[PDB]
Design a protein around this ligand. Structure first.
Ligand SMILES: [Cl-]
Ligand SMILES: [Cl-]
Ligand SMILES: [Cl-]
Ligand SMILES: [Cl-]
Ligand SMILES: [Cl-]
Ligand SMILES: [K+]
Ligand SMILES: [Mg+2]
Ligand SMILES: [Mg+2]
Ligand SMILES: [Mg+2]
Ligand SMILES: [Mg+2]
Ligand SMILES: [Mg+2]
Ligand SMILES: [Mg+2]
Ligand SMILES: [Mg+2]
Ligand SMILES: [Mg+2]
Ligand SMILES: [Mg+2]
Ligand SMILES: [Mg+2]
Ligand SMILES: [Mg+2]
Ligand SMILES: [Mg+2]
Ligand SMILES: [Mg+2]
Ligand SMILES: [Mg+2]
Ligand SMILES: [Mg+2]
Ligand SMILES: [Mg+2]
Ligand SMILES: [Mg+2]
Ligand SMILES: [Mg+2]
Ligand SMILES: [Mg+2]
Ligand SMILES: [Mg+2]
Ligand SMILES: [Mg+2]
Ligand SMILES: [Mg+2]
Ligand SMILES: [Mg+2]
Ligand SMILES: [Mg+2]
Ligand SMILES: [Mg+2]
Ligand SMILES: [Mg+2]
Ligand SMILES: [Mg+2]
Ligand SMILES: [Mg+2]
Ligand SMILES: [Mg+2]
Ligand SMILES: [Mg+2]
Ligand SMILES: [Mg+2]
Ligand SMILES: [Mg+2]
Ligand SMILES: [Mg+2]
Ligand SMILES: [Mg+2]
Ligand SMILES: [Mg+2]
Ligand SMILES: [Mg+2]
Ligand SMILES: [Mg+2]
Ligand SMILES: [Mg+2]
Ligand SMILES: [Mg+2]
Ligand SMILES: [Mg+2]
Ligand SMILES: [Mg+2]
Ligand SMILES: [Mg+2]
Ligand SMILES: [Mg+2]
Ligand SMILES: [Mg+2]
Ligand SMILES: [Mg+2]
Ligand SMILES: [Mg+2]
Ligand SMILES: [Mg+2]
Ligand SMILES: [Mg+2]
Ligand SMILES: [Mg+2]
Ligand SMILES: [Mg+2]
Ligand SMILES: [Mg+2]
Ligand SMILES: [Mg+2]
Ligand SMILES: [Mg+2]
Ligand SMILES: [Mg+2]
Ligand SMILES: [Mg+2]
Ligand SMILES: [Mg+2]
Ligand SMILES: [Mg+2]
Ligand SMILES: [Mg+2]
Ligand SMILES: [Mg+2]
Ligand SMILES: [Mg+2]
Ligand SMILES: [Mg+2]
Ligand SMILES: [Mg+2]
Ligand SMILES: [Mg+2]
Ligand SMILES: [Mg+2]
Ligand SMILES: [Mg+2]
Ligand SMILES: [Mg+2]
Ligand SMILES: [Mg+2]
Ligand SMILES: [Mg+2]
Ligand SMILES: [Mg+2]
Ligand code: NA
Ligand code: NA
Ligand code: NA
Ligand code: NA
Ligand code: NA
Ligand code: NA
Ligand code: NA
Ligand code: NA
Ligand code: NA
Ligand code: NA
Ligand code: NA
Ligand code: NA
Ligand code: NA
Ligand code: NA
Ligand code: NA
Ligand code: NA
Ligand code: NA
Ligand code: NA
Ligand code: NA
Ligand code: NA
Ligand code: NA
Ligand code: NA
Ligand code: NA
Ligand code: NA
Ligand code: NA
Ligand code: NA
Ligand code: NA
Ligand code: NA
Ligand code: NA
Ligand code: NA
Ligand code: NA
Ligand code: NA
Ligand code: NA
Ligand code: NA
Lengths: 237, 7
RNA sequence: UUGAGGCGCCCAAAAUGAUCGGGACUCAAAUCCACCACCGAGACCUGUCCGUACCACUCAUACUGGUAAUCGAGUAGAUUGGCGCUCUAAUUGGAUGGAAGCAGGGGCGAGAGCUCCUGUGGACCGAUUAGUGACGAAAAUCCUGGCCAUAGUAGCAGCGAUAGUCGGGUGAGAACCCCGACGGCCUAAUGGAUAAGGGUUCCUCAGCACUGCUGAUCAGCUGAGGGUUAGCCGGUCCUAAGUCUCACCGCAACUCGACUGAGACGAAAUGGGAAACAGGUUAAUAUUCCUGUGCCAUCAUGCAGUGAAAGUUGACGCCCUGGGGUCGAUCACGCCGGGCAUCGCCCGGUCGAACCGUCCAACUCCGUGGAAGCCGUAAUGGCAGGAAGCGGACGAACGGCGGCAUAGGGAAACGUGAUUCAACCUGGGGCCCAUGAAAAGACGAGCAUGAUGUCCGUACCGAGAACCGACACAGGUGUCCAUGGCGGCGAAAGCCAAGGCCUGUCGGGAGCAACCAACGUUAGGGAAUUCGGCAAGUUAGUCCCGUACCUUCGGAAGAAGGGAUGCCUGCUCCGGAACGGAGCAGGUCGCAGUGACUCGGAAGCUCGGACUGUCUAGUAACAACAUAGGUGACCGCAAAUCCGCAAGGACUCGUACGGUCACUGAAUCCUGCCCAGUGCAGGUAUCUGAACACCUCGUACAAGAGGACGAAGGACCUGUCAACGGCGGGGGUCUUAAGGUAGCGUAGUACCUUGCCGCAUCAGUAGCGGCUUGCAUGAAUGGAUUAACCAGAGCUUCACUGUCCCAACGUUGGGCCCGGUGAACUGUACAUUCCAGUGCGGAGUCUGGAGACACCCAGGGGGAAGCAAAGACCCUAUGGAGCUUUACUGCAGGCUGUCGCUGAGGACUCUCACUCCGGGAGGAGGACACCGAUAGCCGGGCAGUUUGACUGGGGCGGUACGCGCUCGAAAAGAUAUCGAGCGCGCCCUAUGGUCAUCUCAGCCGGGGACCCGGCGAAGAGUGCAAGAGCAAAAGAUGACUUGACAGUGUUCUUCCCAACGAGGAACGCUGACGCGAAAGCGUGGUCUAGCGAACCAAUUAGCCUGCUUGAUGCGGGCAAUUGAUGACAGAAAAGCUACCCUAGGGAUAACAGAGUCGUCACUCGCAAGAGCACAUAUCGACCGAGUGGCUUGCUACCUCGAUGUCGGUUCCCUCCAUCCUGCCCGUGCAGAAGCGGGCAAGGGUGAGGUUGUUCGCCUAUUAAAGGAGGUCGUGAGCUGGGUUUAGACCGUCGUGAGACAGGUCGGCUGCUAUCUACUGGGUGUGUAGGUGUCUGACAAGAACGACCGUAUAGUACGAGAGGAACUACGGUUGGUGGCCACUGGUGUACCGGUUGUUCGAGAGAGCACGUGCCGGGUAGCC
RNA sequence: CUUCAAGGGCGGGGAGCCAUGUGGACACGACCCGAAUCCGGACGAUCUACGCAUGGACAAGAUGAAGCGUGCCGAAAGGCACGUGGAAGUCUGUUAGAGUUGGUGUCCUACAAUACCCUCUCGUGAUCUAUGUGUAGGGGUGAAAGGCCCAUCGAGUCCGGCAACAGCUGGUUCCAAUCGAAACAUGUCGAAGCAUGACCUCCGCCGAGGUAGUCUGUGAGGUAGAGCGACCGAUUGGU
């Protein structure tokens, strides 16, 4: 047959890429030799095209102007701080070690210094639970307990724009416009509606998958479609 | 090739 | 009275025109028995010749003589002698006193071919012999070239752009080249400016051979010249998506490849951007040249300035909106110029830049002020955190104002105000799960004077002739002019300017016929048309009133329905006002007031999809795709998923409110049961599970054999169905897990089926509702349902109407005639055909007849199985491709063990390689991971292939695919079919072998056991089909035995004849045995079935052999046994294709023809029976005999280089087995009404409802509403509803692709007529100059068919009820021919009314599609 | 050679080698043409699909969402009326522009290798459009039709492999003389083909019989017919 859609994707052509040339800023934590003496003032609040959520512009003491993954409640004028001694308020970024347990955190680092990886979507937030001289236990937004180095820096508060998913798109046109700002091919045609040549589910006189939808993890790309390595399906039982 | 000549 | 025979008669019906070949024939020209004489082949006889064979002579196959009664046909094919062509060689010739070739002609040869004469030609050409070979053509839908018919034919008409006419000019020549007038056409274009693209097409002169749909003096044509001028318009510069180069890395390698780093490239209308305006000028350029005026940049000098880089700008989305404001447009008045002439109107003009200077509204801010309710807006809004007011800072236009300008421009005047206001300027509000470039550059940052400002583009077209489309192509092709006038909501129609054009480039003629394209109008009726209202029509603008069901409360809704509508006079209200809007009163015309134009028909029921959206460029726009919404799956990012060979990359400037992978498909009510199979996932005592290392054996090593350990995986267990899918039979459990819940239901799913009932209609295979046992409904393979939406499918109603009854007339372009231009398709040949026949069964050409004088014009297309296409259907080929899968085999990829990198101290620590995070310091990780190598598992993701043959086509079924018997099989042998009966793929250590003893079934008699006797040639038994053999045995009993032995042959068979293997059998030999007294018997079973190659392995005994050589190991070989290929003389092997493709086949199916006639239709013979009695008024079984060729079936003859389907339609001919009509017979015939039959084909046999239907069902009429043939008549006539392509849905089946003798929505109809045929029209020839009038061989007709009524008569008849006829009349219907006084239609002749617009008004006209609309209408045609 | 043995197989009493012509076989293009493939390297996104960059386009009218305002009612929450406002994959619309339902009209050697006319759909958005740019062939692109990738698509185009192979259709050119078939048997993935036989022809050899007809003799045979108290099995009735 022909490569299925998932295979055209990898090639990274236009249709499948994100309009990076239209993105504002690779939101990443600042760096500080140490001390923590760093702090800047919120200058503006902008819309981040890449995440359909607001981001805050900031000017630091050393005259450094950069956009920041904004938590909720951060307004212009506000003064944020980034360092080991940074105050324990919303908006400030500091190593989990200095953050008190039970505090909602966002934009957490996987490895200290990576500048943030976890919890960065609209309104999500991690949860610092356990402290240790060795491990800091964070409960990610997926509900998973993540064991992190207490040296991994993170921002206090929950990500801004929460509740964005509550309103339906209502019409194709609204998806269209949003989709156009992401690295995604849209709309979606179901395999079952295609020709056998184009997808493992294609063909037939009527529309239905030609085999059970649950595919093996070891399946080769081109054949791995439907329910990937499903531990189970359905809602019952 | 499509029924009546040549539809 | 009866028997037999000959000839005939009855029985006896078919489709264009009857037949024995025809004419025709009757004491025959028939038939039968004899007889006579003739005709009639290439046979037979005979003369001569030829060939072939043989004989004699001969070197001879040279002659000569002889023989053939026993020689003379021939496709494929074998054999053999010869002719012709090129060039070489030897020998030898001809030619300018004329070679070759060519044309015509003479002679020879059976012939291929040779040769001569004449003319042409003007320089080469042969013969013999031996060679040579790109050596001989009628053919291949053969190739190239040329040419004829076609044919003076089609096209030069069709397009909402119908365009011209009269004078004249130039000229050899003028319909189309030019001037004028008149008449028109184009209005987002047919005008103006341009991008791309073209590339000289631009201008001028000279031309017409080419090109131009005709002509040309003209030209985008030909030829020669000429033409494009920039500091301030573009390019150039900047950066965009993105691109390239170098470096680095990869790769076997590169002209290859991702990242990273650096550099460069990337915008001419239309991104950003230093600067130019006005006039004049040329045949052609022009913000470029010239005149005037202005501006920018850089540098130089001088003065000022020390500021100088922070900031601003460049620089930005979508929707709504206010304010400022120019051009334009219009209004008022003045001036200049024109026009008009009944008035006093109408048109044009009334100018003047860049730039310099200056003005500033909005926004923001400041002071003052001091609002507790005020300020403000179109709207939102604003304020003690300080509102209004006042004052002020900053601050706009491509705008105003002044200059510019006793510049420029105008014949002149060379205005002033106003409204609405494009451009341009500046604000306010709203939206985003969407956030709406960047860089160079400018500003910030003065002034004078001078210098410099190069390089490239610049013509023209920019399209119904300069571009792409082969064309001067009705197609395609971007931007700006969106503000010209009336009109009106309008960038709409219609009409008209400016500007453009008469080149969407052939004309002339006929009241101009048929026929065709577009179209107008048609009385009465009104969907009767048709698959279907297809096509057309109706409605229509604006205001007022008014508005149902349902509904998601938005909608439905312009529901529906009703009324109004002009002009004129005088006014009111809103507003600053409009040349804006809303109303009032009065007057008044028309058939008509949105008077043209513009401009919805409406309502309901059902189905589908929620909606807008998407799609098969070029037959499908749909119910298909998408969608929001619902759900499931995967993943914590060093992730899941995906790309790359690698170096590396997309997702990702992303992070679970993410994004990947799938399913379902808005809302609403809901979404039952099943984990057995399959899939996915988790677990796992135990079982199974590879390689490395390890243990044993083996080998001086090694190959190799085995063991131990055991990963993923599997077994096993569990979870899971919004995962593939499943939800029955039976009974009051069974398969295989469950056994169909809510719902829905004859469904786009229901075979039966037009289901039953109801609605509706005269009538309803339709539609709707109810029922519903559901062939074969049903829950995210989503079920039910649903407002809104729809070029979706079905149905009903009102309205409307030429769709129809049933056609007519008209309009324009063709058609027809004439001038000019000028193709193509097609062509074996012949060709005036017709009716029949025959023939490979579908003939212009054969056969028999008939008909037929030639040529030409027009027509509609009957035939040439017409033209066009090597049939798509079907089969076949050891053809192709796309697709599928638990087909065969492999290849990626994933998982997993192991080895290397790889290090220190069956679980564990560390750090040092290696990895990752980090700017670094350092942190995490860590001998793992990554990478290289290997092993096991998963593995249609991908690749290559296979998937047999036989067959009354193929498939399914079957195996007649290897064997045996009887019959078929025709008394030797051989012998077919999917022929008839039926078997074999073993079994047996005895069921083999020998010997001894013995005789069986069955029956009878005596004491179904046993015992005795008798009869008993064979019916018993002998392993198994069948057929055959056998009795002191081949059978039975008993005993003994292992010959069912080794080796090697002969022969037959397998395979008749007649080659062919394995296998089988018969008969020997050698060896060794058994039994018997012995002869002898035993080469398995009494005979014919019980079977298997090569390679490879194992096995038996002996030997041969392995690369200089010895030893050991391990190999190679001679002989043979065993292991299987049953498709059985041996491949290792599944499907779909409707997305299809190719080679072919009528070797083979579907359609039609043809043969057949079981089937079907009809008849006849006999006449049981019933018909109250009575076979025969009527009905009529059984059985028997037939005719037809409508049905079906069979066959496979014809066509697969195509003979276009079903149904319908239109139009023509026919058949009789007759429905009606006429004339008759019988009657269970009183009459009337019927029932049955006979002759008979003249005429008739109609209209509608469901259905694509044919068929059939139903309604009302009727004299009756018959059936059938013509290629199931009729697609070079129509239609296209159905079957039967490509899309899609449902049910069923399938793992799947996909299928269906299931249903359903959608789905392109080609061609200019040569021949023949006919309808009509002419020109000639024949009869052999003329005018007029006739005749009538033959030819055509349906020219007439039928019905109702009245008198007869309430009569005959009859108890009555009821109720005729002859005849004479009147009328109707269908058909036919003709005609127009009458009625009716038309009537773009004509006359009138009237809307919009233009000519100033009036008058009088043009346009509104070939009449603007409306009203009337003559002739003619109907 | 096999072999106790026997019996078999192959070979043996000197003819070859070379040359030239010619018949035929096998491999190769193999007498010639004839088709759908398969594979390699290249050239195409001037068409079209999808994306991206930078620009442009949408007369006029209709409906009237939120928000806001005024008035009335209310203790309040709020409600009602009127106005304002101007929302919408909203409506009408040949505005421009886009699309393509019916006529199964015209055309169908066309104006045109997809046109013309009328009718019809959309027309503020998932909109339309110019230019620039990206994706390339078992690969793209695809709101999915196997659609599209320059009149080319169930795997583009060009050239090459290449004179592909075919058991399938078509064709294969001068004269004469002699002989003269087979359309059958066996085997075959074989039945549209081959091989081996039968059969046709040619050559060398052998050397006296041969046997298509008839008669007779010595033999083989169970078909026609017939018949069945002759088997066998069917098939009537009566005392
Ligand atoms: Cl999303
Ligand atoms: Cl000769
Ligand atoms: Cl330019
Ligand atoms: Cl405002
Ligand atoms: Cl009637
Ligand atoms: K055929
Ligand atoms: Mg980032
Ligand atoms: Mg995108
Ligand atoms: Mg979808
Ligand atoms: Mg499909
Ligand atoms: Mg597949
Ligand atoms: Mg579905
Ligand atoms: Mg087809
Ligand atoms: Mg002969
Ligand atoms: Mg000589
Ligand atoms: Mg020939
Ligand atoms: Mg003609
Ligand atoms: Mg005209
Ligand atoms: Mg001239
Ligand atoms: Mg010119
Ligand atoms: Mg550049
Ligand atoms: Mg520009
Ligand atoms: Mg010019
Ligand atoms: Mg110019
Ligand atoms: Mg032209
Ligand atoms: Mg009428
Ligand atoms: Mg009807
Ligand atoms: Mg009818
Ligand atoms: Mg219509
Ligand atoms: Mg007023
Ligand atoms: Mg239905
Ligand atoms: Mg829809
Ligand atoms: Mg199409
Ligand atoms: Mg459509
Ligand atoms: Mg269509
Ligand atoms: Mg969804
Ligand atoms: Mg759908
Ligand atoms: Mg019903
Ligand atoms: Mg369910
Ligand atoms: Mg489905
Ligand atoms: Mg063919
Ligand atoms: Mg087929
Ligand atoms: Mg294939
Ligand atoms: Mg890194
Ligand atoms: Mg495959
Ligand atoms: Mg077959
Ligand atoms: Mg015999
Ligand atoms: Mg024996
Ligand atoms: Mg083998
Ligand atoms: Mg063995
Ligand atoms: Mg065989
Ligand atoms: Mg055999
Ligand atoms: Mg074919
Ligand atoms: Mg045949
Ligand atoms: Mg025909
Ligand atoms: Mg009769
Ligand atoms: Mg008749
Ligand atoms: Mg027919
Ligand atoms: Mg008929
Ligand atoms: Mg016809
Ligand atoms: Mg036709
Ligand atoms: Mg025609
Ligand atoms: Mg149809
Ligand atoms: Mg239909
Ligand atoms: Mg249909
Ligand atoms: Mg007119
Ligand atoms: Mg191959
Ligand atoms: Mg392009
Ligand atoms: Mg309002
Ligand atoms: Mg809309
Ligand atoms: Mg519209
Ligand atoms: Mg398909
Ligand atoms: Mg010959
Ligand atoms: Mg001869
Ligand atoms: Mg007999
Ligand atoms: Na399927
Ligand atoms: Na011959
Ligand atoms: Na000014
Ligand atoms: Na106007
Ligand atoms: Na002309
Ligand atoms: Na729409
Ligand atoms: Na299961
Ligand atoms: Na399971
Ligand atoms: Na079901
Ligand atoms: Na639509
Ligand atoms: Na009409
Ligand atoms: Na004809
Ligand atoms: Na294919
Ligand atoms: Na096979
Ligand atoms: Na044998
Ligand atoms: Na018959
Ligand atoms: Na044919
Ligand atoms: Na028909
Ligand atoms: Na008759
Ligand atoms: Na026919
Ligand atoms: Na027809
Ligand atoms: Na047709
Ligand atoms: Na191939
Ligand atoms: Na392109
Ligand atoms: Na309101
Ligand atoms: Na159309
Ligand atoms: Na390809
Ligand atoms: Na080639
Ligand atoms: Na082949
Ligand atoms: Na064959
Ligand atoms: Na044969
Ligand atoms: Na065969
Ligand atoms: Na003799
Ligand atoms: Na006989």
């Amino acid at each position: 047959g022909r490569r299925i859609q998932g295979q055209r994707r990898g090639r990274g052509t236009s249709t499948f890429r994100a309009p990076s040339h239209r993105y504002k800023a690779d939101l990443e934590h600042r760096k500080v030799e140490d001390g923590d003496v760093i702090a800047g003032t919120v200058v503006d609040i902008e819309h981040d095209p890449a995440r359909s959520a607001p981001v805050a512009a900031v000017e630091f003491e050393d005259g450094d102007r950069r956009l920041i993954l904004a938590p909720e409640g951060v307004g212009v004028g506000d003064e944020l701080q980034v360092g080991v001694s940074a105050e324990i308020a919303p908006g400030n970024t500091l190593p989990l070690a200095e953050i008190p347990e039970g505090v909602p955190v966002c934009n957490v680092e996987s490895s200290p210094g990576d500048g943030g990886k976890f919890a960065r979507a609209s309104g999500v937030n991690a949860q610092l639970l356990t402290h240790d001289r060795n491990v800091a236990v964070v409960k990610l937004p997926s509900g998973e307990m993540k064991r992190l180095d207490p040296q991994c820096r993170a921002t206090i508060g929950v990500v801004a724009g929460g509740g964005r998913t509550d309103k339906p798109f209502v019409k194709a046109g609204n998806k269209h416009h949003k989709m156009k700002a992401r690295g995604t091919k849209w709309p979606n045609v179901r395999g079952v509606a295609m020709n056998a040549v184009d997808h493992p589910f294609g063909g037939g006189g009527r529309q239905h998958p030609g085999k059970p939808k649950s595919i093996s993890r070891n399946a080769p790309p081109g054949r791995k479609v439907g329910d990937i390595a499903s531990k189970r399906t359905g809602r019952g039982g | 090739x499509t029924x009546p000549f040549x539809x």
